[PDB]
Specification:
The PDB classes it as transcription/dna/rna. This is part of a larger assembly, with chains A and B. Chain A is mainly beta. Chain A is built from no helices and 21 strands. Chain A is elongated. Classes of the chains: A mainly beta, B mainly alpha. Chain B binds a DNA duplex through loops.
Chain lengths: ~230, ~80
DNA sequence: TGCATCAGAGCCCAAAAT
DNA sequence: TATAATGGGAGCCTCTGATGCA
C-alpha cells in the first residue's frame, strides 16, 4: 500500500477477485483479506457522562432518549442559554456539538451539553458568573452525529425545561506504530485500562490502553489476500 | 531460480519473523517446565508437525525413535494441556 | 504415417612419454 | 557471535538411432 494511503477494505473482510483494496490497489483473487502491519491504531474510548441543558418550554420536543442526529428542539427566536453556576469553563468540542464543564477549585460544579445549532460564546478557560450567556441557540438544534442520549430527564421551572441528559459517546485517540513494534490487539477489540495494545522493545513506547475502549486499525503496511 | 521465488523481507516482515522465532523458543522452554519433557524432544515434535508428514526421522541425540506413533503420543499429550498452558 | 534434428557413439598398432 | 550487506559464469566430424513435428 502506497505510503500514507489508507485501505478501503478492513482486516478480516471476505474479498472477491477484482475488488479494490486501496485507492491504487486491486485484488487479484477471491479470499480473506488480512492487514499486515498497521501503522496507525485509532482507539475510540467509551465515555458515559451526565450533562445538563435548559430550553424554552415551547421549543423542545419531548422524548425519553435521543438517537444521534435526532431533532432536540426548534426555536422560534434565538435563545441565549445561560450559566447556572459560577466557574472556569473547560470547553471540550466533539466532531459536532460541544461539552462545557464549569469548575471551582478543581472540583467540577456543572457539566452542560451544547447540541448542534448552539454556538459557544465562551472559550476554554473563561471565568463565568451565574446568568451570563454560554451559548447562542438559533433555529433547529439536533443531536450530533457521533453522540447519543441514553436517558432524558426533564424538569420544568417557569417557562423553561432543564434536561438532565445521560450521554454516551466515543472520543478517538491515535497511536503511531513503528516498524520494530507489533500490534498485540485485534481489529474491533475491547480494551480496559492497563491493557496492552501495541508492544515494543523497551517498556516506554508501548501502547497501553488508557481507559475502556474499542480498537481500529488504519494504514496497514500491505494487505495479504488469502 | 528457486532462490528468486521467495521475496525479500521488509524491515517490518524481517522483525516479525525474527520476533516470532525468539518467542517460539521461549515457548518451548515453558512447555519443558510444564510437562517435565525434554526441550529438544519437544522442539522436534513441534518442528515435525510444521514441516509435515514428508520429513519424519530419528534425531541422533533423542533417546526415543521419532516416528508418527511417538510424535502422536507427545502431540496428544501437549493437546491434553489446559488452555493457558 | 514419413521426415528432420539431435544426442551419443565411434575414429590402427607397437615403440616413447625426456 | 551484531553498521549493512540478498540471483553465477564460460562459450567454437560421421553414422546411427529415438524422438518430437508435418
Amino acid at each position: 500500500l502506497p505510503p500514507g494511503v489508507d485501505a478501503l477494505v478492513k482486516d478480516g473482510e471476505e474479498v472477491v477477485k477484482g475488488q479494490e483494496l486501496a485507492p491504487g490497489v486491486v485484488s487479484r483473487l477471491d479470499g480473506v483479506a488480512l492487514y499486515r502491519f498497521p501503522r496507525r491504531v485509532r482507539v475510540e474510548y467509551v465515555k458515559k457522562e451526565r450533562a445538563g441543558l435548559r430550553l424554552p418550554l415551547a421549543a423542545w420536543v419531548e422524548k425519553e432518549a435521543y438517537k444521534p442526529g435526532e431533532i432536540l428542539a426548534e426555536l422560534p427566536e434565538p435563545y441565549l442559554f445561560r450559566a447556572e453556576e459560577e466557574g472556569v469553563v473547560e470547553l471540550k468540542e466533539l466532531e459536532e456539538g460541544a461539552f462545557l464543564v464549569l469548575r471551582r477549585e478543581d472540583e467540577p460544579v456543572a457539566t452542560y451539553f451544547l447540541p448542534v445549532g448552539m454556538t459557544p460564546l465562551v472559550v476554554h478557560g473563561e471565568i463565568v458568573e451565574k446568568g451570563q450567556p454560554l451559548a447562542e441557540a438559533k433555529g433547529l438544534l439536533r443531536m450530533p452525529r457521533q453522540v447519543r442520549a441514553a436517558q432524558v430527564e426533564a424538569e420544568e421551572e417557569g417557562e423553561t425545561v432543564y434536561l438532565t441528559l445521560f450521554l454516551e459517546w466515543t472520543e478517538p485517540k491515535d497511536y503511531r506504530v513503528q516498524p520494530h513494534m507489533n500490534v498485540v490487539v485485534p481489529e474491533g477489540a475491547r480494551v480496559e485500562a492497563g491493557d496492552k495494545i501495541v508492544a515494543a522493545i523497551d517498556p516506554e513506547e508501548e501502547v497501553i490502553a488508557e481507559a475502556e475502549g474499542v480498537v481500529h486499525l488504519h494504514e496497514p503496511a500491505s494487505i495479504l489476500v488469502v | 531460480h528457486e532462490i528468486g521465488q521467495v521475496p525479500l523481507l521488509t524491515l517490518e516482515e524481517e522483525v516479525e519473523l525474527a520476533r516470532k522465532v525468539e518467542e517460539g523458543m521461549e515457548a518451548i522452554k515453558k512447555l519443558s517446565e510444564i510437562t517435565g519433557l525434554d526441550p529438544d524432544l519437544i522442539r522436534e515434535v513441534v518442528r515435525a508437525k510444521i514441516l509435515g508428514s514428508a520429513r519424519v526421522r530419528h534425531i541422533p541425540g533423542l533417546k526415543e525413535t521419532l516416528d508418527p506413533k511417538t510424535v502422536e503420543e507427545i502431540d496428544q499429550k501437549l493437546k491434553s494441556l489446559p488452555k493457558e498452558h
